[PDB]
RNA sequence: GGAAACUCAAAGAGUGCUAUGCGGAGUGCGCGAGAGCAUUUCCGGCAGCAGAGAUUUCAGCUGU
């Protein structure tokens, strides 16, 4: 199952995430939930490019609450942290991973 | 007939055998992620290419 | 459990979920379905007796050829074995260890000489029968299928009478005599 | 060292890159042999990377009598120079897999960059791909290949015997 | 009051679709996971007698063999799937291993052939095709060497010139060829060694130190300038072609059979010679040969090294192949088959996968050399399994009863017979010494891989 | 880095209270140095942990933890646990003897009468309910639910997964209480006589015919960590056992009179013995140290149980209190009832439940739930203990939710695992190891009256 | 005693299914380049200017 070595690629970065004020751990643990139903759904069988739109999405906001949080705790536009590259690298092998799974389609293209 | 006779030949005693046997390294009890880096041949070659004799530096 | 693949055979050979060796081929099983034997432990109550007389036996042949004592007893147990029908005929003392069988102790059970005599047709309609209670042996009614009989009483085994099954084979053959109530 | 392949098909000309190099002294094996009849590790070693179909069915024809006849035509060139890198010099010249030792040197003119492979190794990953087929290119295509090749061959049946009209 | 319990919620464990996957939640707590230690040692067990029950390293033979007997080996070092094979009643091929079967053949020379290798040679006069045929050389008994071209076919470039493209003549006879692995310049062993290249039919140079034959010779692959070559003097002795002289020669107990380069070390090379074991030696330091070979019952015929560097393969008279490790001194493993005899010449294919063993009764085999690896690509789950279950044997390599399933094998009780009467004989000499030992002031240690170097040219 | 469960994590080793060799001074230091960045990324895994455990707590100060009805949970807790805690009622066979599986999905009813029944009981699914007529002391699933062995009048029984019998035990000549070592493959037997008897129940072999010396076995217990069977006999003796050697290992003294239950912590490191002395004791196991001892409560405490998460069952006949934090190693955590005079120093019990007249015979916890499966006389009994259960169980071994395909390949997997009878050890951590003699250091050959001094010379 | 199912349990075979691995730059090398080397070299800061782009985003300057 390498769900679970994506899973775990994505620990340092809320662990960094956590250990400076921003997130606590009990709604870390719900995105990492969230994280690891949608890791599931997408490289389970059958799947579906929607299922990488959706994913795509929650990054996206993910993202943006991060950011929103960065600024009204911390008062600062960025941590210089490991995770303000790593969420849209992410997003971008989300995308690299969809495009190679699924190069038909043009509207994820 | 389960512990070992003497101390193998790259260690020296019984401390160090132990401490190279201290960490199993099934993905049970370790990670994937460590998993998969702590176990990987020193040597790794690509299956189907001849090799060449290394003719580093300066080329 | 699986029908293993190749190499997890080669890999486990001796491993037998359902046949172990202490099971000796499951030989209490196979005669209890051929005998119809209702309880459990009638195999091993039976087989304590072979035993039994084999040990018995193996100790009377050990004793010396000229006394009384041993050449009375062993003609003793010969024709007690004898008066229960274990046997057939009044053998040897060598058919003490190759006739008497678990399965011969058995045959001498009510349900199969009750199928062995045409009474039923098979034995599970015996023990039927005689749990229902229609037979008896002489006198008295039979209610367990662990009697088994003796070389004596293999002749009055026949029905209660009122048993149905009795007037519908008189009223078979049409001699239903009803005065006498059956 | 195979780079690259190119197959020839009804609908138009696909061309794979390879990822893992098949085994070169073992390639008479079972387990060898049997790894180009499993779909999922057939895909191991070979990812599509380029797919242009013919526009027309004329043009389908025309193509089908340049490969018999062993010519290039030029949606082959476009092809075939989109996808091969061009190389410097000498020193690691760029390799194809082809199907045919005629097609060979015809694109080695069209290509001096390029070098051509026809033996065991390439007609044997060949007829993989041709045996998976259209399970490779997950449905980037606008054709299917059996209805596609009825067509094609009676036309090319039709061309080569000059069957007549009226 | 706050009372909550589990919320097992039946959803994120069970999948909502019937095509996708669920999880696999997972605790990586110790006190979940009872046994380690014994759990994983008996997947070590259950690996070694894996590998012992898939250890299935014969191939296959390539061809109806030869006439009389593989004499020479030489594979390109160029290409994967070729190399070129000559026996001694006079007849060459050169060997397609992937269909297994010659290109072409030919009856080259009268007598025997005694050595050959393969060429990418630079004529002044030409660009000298070497992709659309391809060349070897060979010399022999006849006091002859003959540099020969191939119509191989593996590219498709073109559409004629197949044998002898020129002869070279040399006054006596000849014994071992290698070529420099540029600038087309070869050299030959025979009654004295000759340097010369493709473009002139005379010896560019005489080599040798005196008047003795040179048995076999051999360049380098990295550092090309320099080679090595042995002599019936018993004799290493190491030329440079940049200074065009020998410059060092030691003597040892018993003649070398065979040398052999290191292809990543690239100043160490092997020989192998008659006295039953191998001697990976240093170049620069020719008086301690660092590493020795040891487990053989008859003379070691000839030896390469993987391409990997770490790893050689012998061959040797008794009719037996075997492999070892570099820096351990014992089999890894061995190889033989009953048709196989007398076995002269082992090479390692280019990819360090396969061995190729010419013996004497005619046949040249394949051999692979992980004995129980299968040479398929592989999914990952089971690339994870064999290197973990690798990794897991090299760890409980010292268990005593993994290392005794590790280490049965089954030889031939031809060789079973001369190792435990070579190991009685050894506990005696041992135990004599030790007596001697006991009383004598100075009987001084040697060490064995110093015991069996007699001499040395140039000690400091 | 820091990871607060890394001393949860590390694992000790043999130690003395640096080298020459360059080669095995840079093998060491990257051996230890991939093992402290091994132990740092398996413990960053409590991210990827799905939930917590549950509990409770009282956020007040006059309200307690035990005095809470079961009524008062079942309504304030979810309807699917709520629904979980089931209670039959059985009243015509005996009393029944309660073993679920090593997962929390099927469950194994015996009657002491004759009447036993593995069923799922998430699922109301009847797998093999069977009457037999005689009497049936205790009763176990062997590896999955497809294998159960019974311990009937005299010879033990095991069981096919639709109620037919597969093995009557010519060995085993009686019984009284059964266990399953699960990763060997071994169900282990002991009763009136004393013989503990191993039976490797893969081959179908025995293994050791074991004597005991001390009359029957009153209470066997499992250690869960080592796989050592710790038997309580009538001396007050609780000596724990392997298959390799006929002495017992250790012969630990816990209570006074017969001993009346061993349960043994899943972590191997703690011990809950009751006696008929009325008295309980807590033991430390791998320093073999009394921890604390309960004396004198108000009745023999019957059986004890200890869930997954350290958590204390005592059945004091018609009683079920449950104490947390009672496995530390303090002199707070010796469980008590009373906070005399509301003294914040003492266990005053998690939770309590009075029976109504019906002595329970054994206590069991569900494992990965949050409720414990007691049996008592007149049937069986859910009750809902809010912090009895690992959440975070582990799917690669067993699994709550495993269908048939993963079942049989997880069987077959352990089949191939098997863990020899012999290294059953008093410590798992001792197979790697070299011997106690053939000493440390290697040695690599090289190594291995003036007039007397008048009448010297003679 | 024969027959309905979404009745369940247990095995087996076949078909499928992908089964599926510090950063922009700038700075000198590596034969128009990135496939590596190496970083204070400015930045991933602050407001405004004015050119744009759908309130929030980019393009070049002042101080910082």
């Given at each position: 199952?390498?769900?679970?070595?994506?899973?775990?690629?994505?620990?340092?970065?809320?662990?960094?995430?956590?250990?400076?004020?921003?997130?606590?751990?009990?709604?870390?643990?719900?995105?990492?939930?969230?994280?690891?139903?949608?890791?599931?759904?997408?490289?389970?069988?059958?799947?579906?490019?929607?299922?990488?739109?959706?994913?795509?999405?929650?990054?996206?906001?993910?993202?943006?609450?991060?950011?929103?949080?960065?600024?009204?705790?911390?008062?600062?536009?960025?941590?210089?942290?490991?995770?303000?590259?790593?969420?849209?690298?992410?997003?971008?092998?989300?995308?690299?991973?969809?495009?190679?799974?699924?190069?038909?389609?043009?509207?994820?293209? | 007939?389960?512990?070992?006779?003497?101390?193998?030949?790259?260690?020296?005693?019984?401390?160090?055998?132990?401490?190279?046997?201290?960490?199993?390294?099934?993905?049970?009890?370790?990670?994937?992620?460590?998993?998969?880096?702590?176990?990987?041949?020193?040597?790794?070659?690509?299956?189907?290419?001849?090799?060449?004799?290394?003719?580093?530096?300066?080329? | 459990v699986?029908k293993?693949?190749?190499?997890?055979?080669?890999?486990?050979?001796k491993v037998d979920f359902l046949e172990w060796k202490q099971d000796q081929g499951h030989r209490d099983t196979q005669v209890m379905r051929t005998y119809h034997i209702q309880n459990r432990e009638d195999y091993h109550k039976y087989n304590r007796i072979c035993g039994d007389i084999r040990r018995l036996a193996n100790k009377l042949s050990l004793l010396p050829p000229t006394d009384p004592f041993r050449r009375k007893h062993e003609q003793l147990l010969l024709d007690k074995l004898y008066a229960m029908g274990v046997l057939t005929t009044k053998s040897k003392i060598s058919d003490l260890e190759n006739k008497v069988t678990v399965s011969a102790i058995c045959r001498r059970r009510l349900p199969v000489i009750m199928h062995r005599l045409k009474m039923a047709e098979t034995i599970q309609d015996a023990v039927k029968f005689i749990e229902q209670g229609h037979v008896r042996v002489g006198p008295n009614l039979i209610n367990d299928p662990a009697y088994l009989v003796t070389r004596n009483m293999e002749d009055y085994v026949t029905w209660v009478d009122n048993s149905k099954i009795k007037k519908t084979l008189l009223r078979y053959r049409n001699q239903i005599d009803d005065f006498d109530f059956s | 060292?195979?780079?690259?392949?190119?197959?020839?098909?009804?609908?138009?000309?696909?061309?794979?890159?390879?990822?893992?190099?098949?085994?070169?002294?073992?390639?008479?094996?079972?387990?060898?042999?049997?790894?180009?009849?499993?779909?999922?590790?057939?895909?191991?070693?070979?990812?599509?990377?380029?797919?242009?179909?013919?526009?027309?069915?004329?043009?389908?024809?025309?193509?089908?009598?340049?490969?018999?006849?062993?010519?290039?035509?030029?949606?082959?060139?476009?092809?075939?120079?989109?996808?091969?890198?061009?190389?410097?010099?000498?020193?690691?010249?760029?390799?194809?897999?082809?199907?045919?030792?005629?097609?060979?040197?015809?694109?080695?003119?069209?290509?001096?960059?390029?070098?051509?492979?026809?033996?065991?190794?390439?007609?044997?990953?060949?007829?993989?791909?041709?045996?998976?087929?259209?399970?490779?290119?997950?449905?980037?295509?606008?054709?299917?290949?059996?209805?596609?090749?009825?067509?094609?061959?009676?036309?090319?049946?039709?061309?080569?015997?000059?069957?007549?009209?009226? | 009051?706050?009372?909550?319990?589990?919320?097992?919620?039946?959803?994120?464990?069970?999948?909502?679709?019937?095509?996708?996957?669920?999880?696999?939640?997972?605790?990586?707590?110790?006190?979940?996971?009872?046994?380690?230690?014994?759990?994983?040692?008996?997947?070590?067990?259950?690996?070694?007698?894996?590998?012992?029950?898939?250890?299935?390293?014969?191939?296959?033979?390539?061809?109806?063999?030869?006439?009389?007997?593989?004499?020479?080996?030489?594979?390109?070092?160029?290409?994967?799937?070729?190399?070129?094979?000559?026996?001694?009643?006079?007849?060459?091929?050169?060997?397609?291993?992937?269909?297994?079967?010659?290109?072409?053949?030919?009856?080259?020379?009268?007598?025997?052939?005694?050595?050959?290798?393969?060429?990418?040679?630079?004529?002044?006069?030409?660009?000298?095709?070497?992709?659309?045929?391809?060349?070897?050389?060979?010399?022999?008994?006849?006091?002859?060497?003959?540099?020969?071209?191939?119509?191989?076919?593996?590219?498709?470039?073109?559409?004629?010139?197949?044998?002898?493209?020129?002869?070279?003549?040399?006054?006596?006879?000849?014994?071992?060829?290698?070529?420099?692995?540029?600038?087309?310049?070869?050299?030959?062993?025979?009654?004295?060694?000759?340097?010369?290249?493709?473009?002139?039919?005379?010896?560019?140079?005489?080599?040798?130190?005196?008047?003795?034959?040179?048995?076999?010779?051999?360049?380098?692959?990295?550092?090309?300038?320099?080679?090595?070559?042995?002599?019936?003097?018993?004799?290493?002795?190491?030329?440079?072609?940049?200074?065009?002289?020998?410059?060092?020669?030691?003597?040892?107990?018993?003649?070398?059979?065979?040398?052999?380069?290191?292809?990543?070390?690239?100043?160490?090379?092997?020989?192998?010679?008659?006295?039953?074991?191998?001697?990976?030696?240093?170049?620069?330091?020719?008086?301690?040969?660092?590493?020795?070979?040891?487990?053989?019952?008859?003379?070691?015929?000839?030896?390469?090294?993987?391409?990997?560097?770490?790893?050689?393969?012998?061959?040797?008279?008794?009719?037996?192949?075997?492999?070892?490790?570099?820096?351990?001194?014992?089999?890894?493993?061995?190889?033989?088959?009953?048709?196989?005899?007398?076995?002269?010449?082992?090479?390692?294919?280019?990819?360090?996968?396969?061995?190729?063993?010419?013996?004497?009764?005619?046949?040249?085999?394949?051999?692979?050399?992980?004995?129980?690896?299968?040479?398929?690509?592989?999914?990952?789950?089971?690339?994870?399994?064999?290197?973990?279950?690798?990794?897991?044997?090299?760890?409980?390599?010292?268990?005593?009863?993994?290392?005794?399933?590790?280490?049965?094998?089954?030889?031939?009780?031809?060789?079973?017979?001369?190792?435990?009467?070579?190991?009685?004989?050894?506990?005696?000499?041992?135990?004599?010494?030790?007596?001697?030992?006991?009383?004598?002031?100075?009987?001084?240690?040697?060490?064995?891989?110093?015991?069996?170097?007699?001499?040395?040219?140039?000690?400091? | 880095?820091?990871?607060?469960?890394?001393?949860?994590?590390?694992?000790?080793?043999?130690?003395?209270?640096?080298?020459?060799?360059?080669?095995?001074?840079?093998?060491?230091?990257?051996?230890?140095?991939?093992?402290?960045?091994?132990?740092?990324?398996?413990?960053?895994?409590?991210?990827?942990?799905?939930?917590?455990?549950?509990?409770?707590?009282?956020?007040?100060?006059?309200?307690?933890?035990?005095?809470?009805?079961?009524?008062?949970?079942?309504?304030?807790?979810?309807?699917?646990?709520?629904?979980?805690?089931l209670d039959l009622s059985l009243k015509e066979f005996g009393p029944y003897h309660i073993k679920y599986a090593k997962?929390?999905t099927h469950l194994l009813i015996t009657g002491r009468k004759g009447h036993v029944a593995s069923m799922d009981w998430?699922?109301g699914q009847l797998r093999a309910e069977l009457f037999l007529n005689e009497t049936c002391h205790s009763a176990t699933y062997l590896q999955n639910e497809q294998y159960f062995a019974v311990a009937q009048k005299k010879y033990t029984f095991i069981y096919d997964h639709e109620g037919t019998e597969l093995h009557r035990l010519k060995q085993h000549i009686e019984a009284r209480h059964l266990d399953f070592l699960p990763?060997?493959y071994l169900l282990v037997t002991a009763g009136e006589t004393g013989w503990l008897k191993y039976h490797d129940v893969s081959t179908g072999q025995l293994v050791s015919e074991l004597r005991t010396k001390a009359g029957p076995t009153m209470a066997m217990a499992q250690?869960?960590?080592?796989?050592?069977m710790?038997l309580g006999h009538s001396?007050?003796?609780?000596?724990?056992?392997?298959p390799?050697?006929?002495?017992?290992?250790?012969?630990?003294?816990?209570?006074?009179?017969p001993?009346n239950s061993?349960?043994?912590?899943?972590?191997?490191?703690?011990?809950?013995?009751?006696?008929?002395?009325?008295?309980?004791?807590?033991?430390?196991?791998?320093?073999?140290?009394?921890?604390?001892?309960?004396?004198?409560?108000?009745?023999?405490?019957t059986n004890?149980?200890?869930?997954?998460?350290?958590?204390?069952?005592?059945?004091?006949?018609?009683?079920?209190?449950?104490?947390?934090?009672?496995?530390?190693?303090?002199?707070?955590?010796?469980?008590?009832?009373?906070?005399?005079?509301?003294?914040?120093?003492?266990?005053?019990?998690?939770?309590?439940?009075?029976?109504?007249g019906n002595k329970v015979e054994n206590?069991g916890?569900?494992?990965?739930?949050?409720?414990?499966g007691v049996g008592h006389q007149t049937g069986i009994t859910?009750?809902?203990?809010?912090?009895?259960?690992?959440?975070?169980?582990?799917?690669?071994?067993?699994?709550?939710?495993?269908?048939?395909?993963?079942?049989?390949?997880?069987e077959?997997?352990?089949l191939?695992?098997?863990?020899?009878a012999?290294?059953?050890?008093?410590?798992?951590?001792?197979?790697?190891?070299?011997?106690?003699?053939?000493?440390?250091?290697?040695?690599?050959?090289?190594?291995?009256?003036?007039?007397?001094?008048?009448?010297?010379?003679?």
């Amino acid at each position: 199952s390498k769900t679970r070595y994506y899973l775990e690629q994505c620990i340092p970065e809320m662990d960094d995430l956590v250990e400076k004020g921003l997130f606590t751990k009990n709604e870390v643990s719900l995105i990492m939930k969230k994280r690891t139903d949608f890791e599931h759904r997408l490289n389970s069988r059958g799947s579906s490019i929607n299922d990488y739109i959706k994913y795509i999405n929650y990054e996206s906001n993910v993202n943006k609450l991060r950011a929103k949080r960065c600024k009204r705790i911390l008062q600062v536009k960025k941590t210089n942290s490991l995770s303000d590259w790593s969420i849209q690298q992410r997003i971008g092998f989300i995308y690299q991973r969809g495009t190679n799974k699924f190069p038909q389609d043009l509207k994820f293209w | 007939k389960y512990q070992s006779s003497a101390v193998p030949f790259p260690f020296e005693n019984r401390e160090q055998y132990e401490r190279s046997l201290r960490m199993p390294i099934g993905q049970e009890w370790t990670s994937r992620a460590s998993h998969q880096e702590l176990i990987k041949p020193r040597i790794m070659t690509k299956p189907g290419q001849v090799i060449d004799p290394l003719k580093a530096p300066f080329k | 459990v699986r029908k293993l693949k190749h190499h997890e055979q080669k890999l486990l050979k001796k491993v037998d979920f359902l046949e172990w060796k202490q099971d000796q081929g499951h030989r209490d099983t196979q005669v209890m379905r051929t005998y119809h034997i209702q309880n459990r432990e009638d195999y091993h109550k039976y087989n304590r007796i072979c035993g039994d007389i084999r040990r018995l036996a193996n100790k009377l042949s050990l004793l010396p050829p000229t006394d009384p004592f041993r050449r009375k007893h062993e003609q003793l147990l010969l024709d007690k074995l004898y008066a229960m029908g274990v046997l057939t005929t009044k053998s040897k003392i060598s058919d003490l260890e190759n006739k008497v069988t678990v399965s011969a102790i058995c045959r001498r059970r009510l349900p199969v000489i009750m199928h062995r005599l045409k009474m039923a047709e098979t034995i599970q309609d015996a023990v039927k029968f005689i749990e229902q209670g229609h037979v008896r042996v002489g006198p008295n009614l039979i209610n367990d299928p662990a009697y088994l009989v003796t070389r004596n009483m293999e002749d009055y085994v026949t029905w209660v009478d009122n048993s149905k099954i009795k007037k519908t084979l008189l009223r078979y053959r049409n001699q239903i005599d009803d005065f006498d109530f059956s | 060292p195979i780079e690259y392949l190119l197959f020839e098909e009804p609908t138009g000309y696909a061309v794979f890159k390879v990822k893992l190099q098949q085994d070169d002294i073992g390639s008479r094996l079972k387990e060898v042999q049997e790894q180009i009849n499993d779909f999922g590790a057939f895909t191991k070693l070979i990812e599509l990377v380029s797919f242009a179909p013919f526009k027309g069915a004329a043009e389908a024809l025309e193509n089908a009598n340049d490969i018999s006849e062993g010519l290039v035509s030029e949606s082959l060139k476009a092809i075939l120079d989109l996808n091969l890198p061009k190389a410097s010099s000498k020193k690691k010249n760029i390799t194809l897999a082809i199907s045919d030792k005629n097609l060979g040197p015809s694109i080695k003119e069209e290509f001096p960059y390029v070098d051509c492979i026809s033996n065991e190794l390439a007609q044997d990953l060949i007829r993989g791909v041709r045996l998976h087929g259209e399970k490779l290119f997950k449905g980037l295509q606008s054709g299917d290949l059996e209805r596609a090749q009825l067509g094609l061959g009676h036309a090319y049946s039709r061309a080569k015997v000059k069957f007549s009209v009226q | 009051m706050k009372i909550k319990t589990i919320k097992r919620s039946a959803d994120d464990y069970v999948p909502v679709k019937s095509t996708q996957e669920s999880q696999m939640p997972r605790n990586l707590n110790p006190e979940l996971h009872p046994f380690e230690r014994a759990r994983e040692y008996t997947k070590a067990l259950n690996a070694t007698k894996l590998e012992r029950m898939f250890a299935k390293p014969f191939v296959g033979q390539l061809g109806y063999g030869h006439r009389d007997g593989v004499y020479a080996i030489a594979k390109n070092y160029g290409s994967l799937n070729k190399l070129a094979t000559g026996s001694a009643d006079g007849v060459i091929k050169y060997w397609n291993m992937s269909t297994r079967e010659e290109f072409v053949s030919f009856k080259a020379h009268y007598g025997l052939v005694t050595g050959l290798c393969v060429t990418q040679p630079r004529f002044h006069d030409k660009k000298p095709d070497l992709k659309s045929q391809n060349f070897m050389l060979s010399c022999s008994d006849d006091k002859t060497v003959k540099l020969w071209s191939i119509n191989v076919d593996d590219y498709s470039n073109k559409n004629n010139e197949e044998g002898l493209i020129r002869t070279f003549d040399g006054e006596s006879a000849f014994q071992g060829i290698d070529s420099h692995r540029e600038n087309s310049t070869f050299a030959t062993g025979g009654a004295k060694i000759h340097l010369w290249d493709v473009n002139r039919l005379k010896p560019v140079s005489d080599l040798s130190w005196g008047a003795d034959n040179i048995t076999s010779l051999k360049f380098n692959q990295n550092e090309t300038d320099i080679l090595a070559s042995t002599g019936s003097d018993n004799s290493i002795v190491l030329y440079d072609l940049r200074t065009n002289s020998p410059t060092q020669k030691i003597v040892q107990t018993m003649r070398t059979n065979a040398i052999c380069w290191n292809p990543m070390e690239a100043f160490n090379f092997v020989t192998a010679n008659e006295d039953h074991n191998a001697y990976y030696y240093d170049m620069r330091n020719l008086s301690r040969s660092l590493n020795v070979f040891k487990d053989h019952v008859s003379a070691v015929m000839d030896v390469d090294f993987s391409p990997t560097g770490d790893e050689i393969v012998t061959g040797s008279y008794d009719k037996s192949i075997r492999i070892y490790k570099t820096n351990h001194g014992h089999s890894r493993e061995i190889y033989h088959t009953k048709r196989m005899q007398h076995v002269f010449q082992v090479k390692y294919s280019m990819d360090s996968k396969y061995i190729i063993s010419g013996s004497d009764d005619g046949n040249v085999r394949l051999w692979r050399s992980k004995a129980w690896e299968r040479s398929n690509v592989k999914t990952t789950r089971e690339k994870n399994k064999l290197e973990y279950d690798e990794k897991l044997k090299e760890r409980f390599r010292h268990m005593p009863e993994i290392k005794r399933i590790s280490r049965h094998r089954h030889v031939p009780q031809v060789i079973k017979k001369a190792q435990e009467i070579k190991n009685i004989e050894l506990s005696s000499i041992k135990r004599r010494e030790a007596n001697e030992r006991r009383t004598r002031k100075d009987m001084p240690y040697i060490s064995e891989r110093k015991k069996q170097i007699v001499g040395t040219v140039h000690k400091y | 880095k820091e990871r607060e469960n890394q001393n949860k994590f590390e694992r000790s080793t043999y130690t003395n209270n640096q080298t020459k060799d360059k080669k095995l001074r840079a093998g060491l230091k990257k051996i230890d140095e991939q093992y402290k960045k091994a132990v740092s990324s398996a413990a960053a895994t409590d991210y990827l942990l799905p939930e917590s455990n549950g509990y409770l707590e009282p956020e007040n100060e006059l309200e307690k933890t035990f005095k809470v009805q079961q009524s008062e949970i079942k309504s304030s807790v979810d309807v699917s646990t709520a629904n979980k805690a089931l209670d039959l009622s059985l009243k015509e066979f005996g009393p029944y003897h309660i073993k679920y599986a090593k997962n929390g999905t099927h469950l194994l009813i015996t009657g002491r009468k004759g009447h036993v029944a593995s069923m799922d009981w998430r699922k109301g699914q009847l797998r093999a309910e069977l009457f037999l007529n005689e009497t049936c002391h205790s009763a176990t699933y062997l590896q999955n639910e497809q294998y159960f062995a019974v311990a009937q009048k005299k010879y033990t029984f095991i069981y096919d997964h639709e109620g037919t019998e597969l093995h009557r035990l010519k060995q085993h000549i009686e019984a009284r209480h059964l266990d399953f070592l699960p990763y060997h493959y071994l169900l282990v037997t002991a009763g009136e006589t004393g013989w503990l008897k191993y039976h490797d129940v893969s081959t179908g072999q025995l293994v050791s015919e074991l004597r005991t010396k001390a009359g029957p076995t009153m209470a066997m217990a499992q250690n869960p960590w080592n796989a050592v069977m710790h038997l309580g006999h009538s001396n007050g003796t609780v000596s724990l056992w392997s298959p390799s050697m006929p002495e017992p290992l250790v012969k630990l003294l816990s209570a006074r009179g017969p001993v009346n239950s061993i349960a043994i912590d899943r972590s191997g490191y703690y011990m809950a013995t009751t006696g008929a002395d009325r008295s309980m004791k807590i033991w430390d196991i791998r320093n073999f140290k009394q921890l604390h001892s309960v004396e004198s409560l108000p009745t023999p405490g019957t059986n004890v149980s200890i869930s997954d998460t350290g958590l204390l069952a005592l059945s004091r006949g018609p009683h079920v209190t449950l104490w947390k934090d009672a496995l530390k190693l303090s002199g707070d955590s010796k469980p008590c009832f009373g906070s005399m005079g509301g003294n914040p120093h003492r266990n005053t019990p998690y939770m309590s439940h009075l029976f109504a007249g019906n002595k329970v015979e054994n206590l069991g916890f569900v494992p990965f739930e949050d409720l414990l499966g007691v049996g008592h006389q007149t049937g069986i009994t859910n009750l809902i203990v809010p912090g009895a259960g690992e959440a975070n169980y582990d799917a690669l071994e067993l699994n709550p939710f495993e269908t048939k395909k993963q079942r049989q390949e997880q069987e077959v997997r352990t089949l191939l695992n098997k863990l020899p009878a012999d290294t059953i050890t008093l410590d798992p951590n001792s197979i790697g190891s070299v011997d106690k003699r053939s000493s440390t250091i290697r040695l690599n050959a090289k190594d291995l009256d003036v007039i007397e001094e008048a009448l010297s010379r003679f």
